[PDB]
Enzyme design. Structure first.
Site, mmCIF file in Angstrom:
data_model
loop_
_atom_site.group_PDB
_atom_site.id
_atom_site.type_symbol
_atom_site.label_atom_id
_atom_site.label_comp_id
_atom_site.label_asym_id
_atom_site.label_seq_id
_atom_site.Cartn_x
_atom_site.Cartn_y
_atom_site.Cartn_z
ATOM 1 N N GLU A 170 31.012 9.390 5.494
ATOM 2 C CA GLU A 170 30.680 10.791 5.754
ATOM 3 C C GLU A 170 30.179 10.989 7.186
ATOM 4 O OE1 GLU A 170 31.070 13.483 3.922
ATOM 5 O OE2 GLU A 170 31.673 12.630 1.995
ATOM 6 N N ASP A 171 31.002 10.556 8.141
ATOM 7 C CA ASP A 171 30.779 10.699 9.579
ATOM 8 C C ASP A 171 29.594 9.901 10.097
ATOM 9 O OD1 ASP A 171 32.897 12.489 9.475
ATOM 10 O OD2 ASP A 171 31.566 14.223 9.291
ATOM 11 N N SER A 172 29.053 8.976 9.316
ATOM 12 C CA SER A 172 28.074 8.056 9.866
ATOM 13 C C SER A 172 28.767 7.036 10.765
ATOM 14 C CB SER A 172 27.312 7.348 8.751
ATOM 15 O OG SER A 172 26.304 8.179 8.207
#
Ligand code: MG
Ligand code: ZN
Ligand code: ZN
Ligand code: ZN
EC number: 2.7.7.6
Lengths: 147, 265, 45, 69, 87, 171, 115
Positions: A3-5
């Site tokens: 999740e876009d980490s």
RNA sequence: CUAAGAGUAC
């Protein structure tokens, strides 16, 4: 890294990847409230000063400033300013006629800290002294930073 | 009897060898220990007396902490945390001092050859910054215009790369096994032909190619690793491998010691 | 007293509270306070 | 600003190869790839450290010192 | 209140405790336990008031009654003893 | 605007349970819960008071029955404090505390579910990957808020009605 | 701000020991050993050496969270064989192998002329 | 205090 980490290499950070400098400047002036009610840059004394902030005043030297190179933390006073007031007022339990000055100091930001980088003294348009204090800190990337 | 080693290349700062008759776990543990478990000397504290340069004080401190220092006899030094002194003494630290002035009309380069050891070393072989290039000047630390001065004193302690990467002696470590993919530990991505699209490794010359008709060998395990250790310069490249083996052995022995000492209580 | 440096002369000037804030060599009105004398400690990390 | 002491990725000391790199580009008229290979930078992690460096310190040095002794 | 109170013999509400009734009963009992109210069950070493109240509810030793209000203002009194905690 | 609330950036954690939320240590030290002194918890509350407010776990205040509030900062000068039944210890939120957890564009109930506290040593809220769908939350810089209940009734109904597992199937 | 000190990755904290052993109630003759201030480096090696043993029925390890430097190793041996003894034998074998490796590398390095 | 502007996540 879902999740876009992102997963950043700790050792690369240790060697200087994406390290940054941050400078912040605080400005302060002494102002002519009246003909002879000029504010004065100084180190306030608890004996004859009102509304002195809970932060420590120890780091201020004689002219109500901090020499560059001194570490400062949150809520520490970096500019010491006082203004004259009408004397002979008694209240609050520990207010006597000696408290003839009101503290108008400028503390450091409650969340920030760093080394004082450069303090500058000069005169404004009206001819009154004013100062600018620049504080430097180092931002190292950590969990939560945006790239 | 046990793990066997045959080294292909020996250099000042690189060693390239084959580690055969050993488990994959042992080789990987040795690689990890070489990366981040060998003690080394590096500057840890900086006192800036004067800095009129164009760089910030902590900028220069970060650069200084990354300067490699000689660590041949670092086993004789003690950690600052388990020393009886107040802050730093001769039994647990090395004190260097940098003092540069811009007296020349052109720009003056402050290198790491200008670092001077002040504290006595008591005959050890630690402290000296590592010089590699032919000019003799070390790492370019800073630059000075005319009239600018930099005076500072550095305290260097011993530490490992887990606490900070500045104490790492090992640079990049090449690690490979099974160049021909006979163990089928990878499934090769391809478009038309996986053999043409994937370049052969240089180690494929050291193993027999598969016969292309034989059945898959399901009993074969992984051994015969090819490794290449590079040295930053703090310790000789062979000492990196030797001390990594020693440190891993020490860790296992400490596990045994804790088990036995809590068995007797 | 307390020392300052002119912005465009690098000249050291000790000034008291009653002194006018100016440079005695060129008349410049921008002054930078001098470096502190107390030791500063930096972690090389 | 000024050349980094070490490669971010692997940690090879590249801080002492800057002036030699500039000398190779200037005196020997070598291209960037051959100059990087001559200094011993074989992994592209180190090649990007030296190749993409912007030496801003010179611009800072063009200004007159604030405190001149 | 005599007119409002529906007699016990002709209550027409569900005999099952609702989720909100259970949540408020547990909260009320845990709050009382936290303020040194006497405990009606034997403790097996638990110290959390909420789980003490849960244990009290599991074996029906909570001496409270729900006053369910009908929309017209009338109410029915259902004791926690006789409410079936199916959830 | 309300008190006992926190807000910060969120990061995912595959090693947390579905109903757990990772709370930064400083946030856990700022936010407090008032626990009534009882014969069943006198020892641990006394220990938290001894530890003080500067280290976690610890207590920040002692609310006496008379209403006077002993600030544990500057109170070590007075010495050890003897706790009496019925007093309150306003103490740092520890593990397994029910806390309401919200993402501000709250469009339905499942965007305000209740989690269990897990104290972590960094500056971001940490939550399970699966629970991000009801929150409509990514980790590209999203911020989320935390509310701490201050009584046993609110705590109980927050755990028994708004808990994450109870919201798995939505109406 | 909230970042923990790096030395906590390897220095034992106050009041905690390197090992702690807990009996496992799921299966007979099984234990769970918690290693403190350790990581995959030691865990993988210990696991592999235990699996080399013939009287070990089960051997596994896991690092529950990357934040904290500790890991758990579950060992189950056959009846009449103490899991602690299996751990001791695994460590002894690891040490012997490492010693032989160090000797072999030193002998091979001493044969170099271009070093 | 008020006003204005630049934003961040939807
Ligand atoms: Mg987002
Ligand atoms: Zn010492
Ligand atoms: Zn001048
Ligand atoms: Zn590199």
């Amino acid at each position: 890294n879902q999740e876009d980490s992102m997963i950043m290499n700790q050792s690369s950070i240790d060697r200087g990847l994406f390290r940054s400098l941050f400078f912040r400047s605080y400005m302060d002036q002494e102002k002519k409230y009246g003909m002879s009610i000029t504010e004065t840059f100084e180190k306030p004394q608890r004996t004859n000063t009102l509304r002195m902030k809970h932060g420590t005043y120890d780091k201020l030297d004689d002219d109500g400033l901090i020499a560059p190179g001194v570490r400062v933390s949150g809520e520490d006073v970096i500019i010491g300013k006082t203004t004259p007031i009408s004397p002979d007022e008694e209240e609050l339990g520990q207010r006597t006629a000696y408290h003839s000055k009101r503290d108008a100091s400028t503390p450091l930001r409650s969340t920030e800290n760093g080394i004082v980088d450069q303090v500058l003294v000069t005169t404004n348009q009206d001819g009154l002294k004013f100062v600018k204090v620049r504080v430097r800190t180092t931002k190292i990337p950590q969990i939560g930073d945006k790239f | 009897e046990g793990p066997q080693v045959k080294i292909r290349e020996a250099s000042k700062d690189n060693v390239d060898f084959i580690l055969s008759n050993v488990d994959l776990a042992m080789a990987n543990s040795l690689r990890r220990v070489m990366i981040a478990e060998i003690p080394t000397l590096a500057i840890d504290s900086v006192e800036v007396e004067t800095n009129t340069t164009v760089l910030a004080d902590e900028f220069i401190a970060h650069r200084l902490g990354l300067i490699p220092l000689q660590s041949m006899d670092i086993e004789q030094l003690e950690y600052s945390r388990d020393c009886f002194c107040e802050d730093h003494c001769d039994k647990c630290s090395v004190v260097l001092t940098l003092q540069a002035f811009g007296e020349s009309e052109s720009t003056t380069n402050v290198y790491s050859k200008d670092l001077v050891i002040v504290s006595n070393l008591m005959g050890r072989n630690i402290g000296h910054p590592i010089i590699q290039d032919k000019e003799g000047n070390g790492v370019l630390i800073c630059k000075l215009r005319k009239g600018q001065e930099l005076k500072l004193t550095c305290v260097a302690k011993k530490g490992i790369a887990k606490e900070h990467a500045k104490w790492g002696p090992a640079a990049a470590i090449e690690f490979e096994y099974d160049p021909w993919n006979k163990l089928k530990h990878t499934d090769y991505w391809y478009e038309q032909d996986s053999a043409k699209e994937w370049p052969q490794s240089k180690n494929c010359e050291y193993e027999d190619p598969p016969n292309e008709g034989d059945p898959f060998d399901y009993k074969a395990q992984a051994d015969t690793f090819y490794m290449n250790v590079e040295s930053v310069g703090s310790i000789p490249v062979d000492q990196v491998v030797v001390r990594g083996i020693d440190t891993l052995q020490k860790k296992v022995a400490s596990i045994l010691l804790a088990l036995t000492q809590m068995d007797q209580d | 007293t307390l020392k300052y440096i002119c912005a465009e002369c690098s000249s050291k000037l000790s000034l008291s509270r009653t002194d006018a804030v100016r440079c005695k060599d060129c008349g410049h009105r921008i002054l930078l306070k001098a470096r502190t004398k107390r030791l500063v400690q930096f972690e090389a990390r | 600003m000024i050349v980094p002491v070490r490669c971010f990725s692997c940690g090879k000391v590249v801080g002492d190869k800057w002036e030699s790199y500039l000398n190779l580009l200037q005196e020997d008229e070598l291209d960037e790839g051959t100059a990087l290979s001559r200094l011993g930078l074989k992994r592209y992690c180190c090649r990007r450290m030296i190749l993409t460096h912007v030496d801003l310190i010179e611009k800072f040095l063009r200004y007159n010192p604030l405190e001149k002794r | 209140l005599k007119e409002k109170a529906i007699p016990k013999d002709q209550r027409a509400t569900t005999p099952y405790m609702t989720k909100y009734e259970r949540a408020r009963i547990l909260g009320t009992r845990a709050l009382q336990i936290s303020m040194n109210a006497p405990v009606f069950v034997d403790l097996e070493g638990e110290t959390d008031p909420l789980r003490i109240a849960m244990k009290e509810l599991a074996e029906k030793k909570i001496p409270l009654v729900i006053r369910r209000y009908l929309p017209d203002g009338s109410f029915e009194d259902w004791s926690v003893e006789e409410l079936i905690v199916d959830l | 605007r309300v008190d006992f609330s926190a807000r910060t950036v969120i990061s995912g954690d595959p090693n947390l349970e579905l109903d757990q939320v990772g709370v930064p240590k400083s946030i856990a030290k700022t936010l407090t819960y008032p626990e009534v002194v009882t014969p069943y918890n006198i020892d641990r509350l006394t220990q938290l008071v001894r530890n003080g407010p500067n280290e976690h776990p610890g207590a920040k205040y002692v609310i006496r029955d008379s209403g006077d509030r002993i600030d544990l900062r500057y109170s070590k000068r007075a010495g050890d404090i003897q706790l009496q039944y019925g007093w309150k210890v306003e103490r740092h939120i520890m593990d397994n505390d029910p806390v309401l957890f919200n993402r501000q564009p709250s469009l339905h109930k499942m965007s305000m579910m209740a989690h269990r506290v897990k104290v972590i040593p960094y500056s971001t809220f940490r939550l399970n990957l699966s629970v991000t769908s009801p929150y409509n939350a990514d980790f590209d810089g999203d911020e989320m808020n935390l509310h701490v209940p201050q009584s046993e009734e609110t705590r109980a109904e927050l755990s028994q009605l708004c808990a994450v597992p109870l919201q798995i199937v939505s109406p | 701000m909230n970042a923990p000190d790096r030395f906590e990755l390897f220095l034992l904290g106050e009041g905690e020991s390197k090992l702690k052993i807990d009996p496992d109630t799921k299966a007979p003759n099984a234990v769970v050993i918690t290693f403190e201030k350790e990581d995959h480096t030691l865990g993988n090696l210990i696991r592999a050496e235990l699996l080399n043993d013939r009287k070990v029925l089960f051997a596994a390890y896991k690092v529950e969270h990357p934040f904290f430097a500790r890991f758990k190793l579950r060992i189950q041996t056959t009846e009449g064989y103490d899991p602690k003894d299996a751990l001791k034998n695994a460590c002894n074998s690891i040490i012997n192998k490492l010693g032989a490796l160090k000797t072999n590398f030193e002998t091979e390095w001493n044969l170099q002329t271009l070093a």
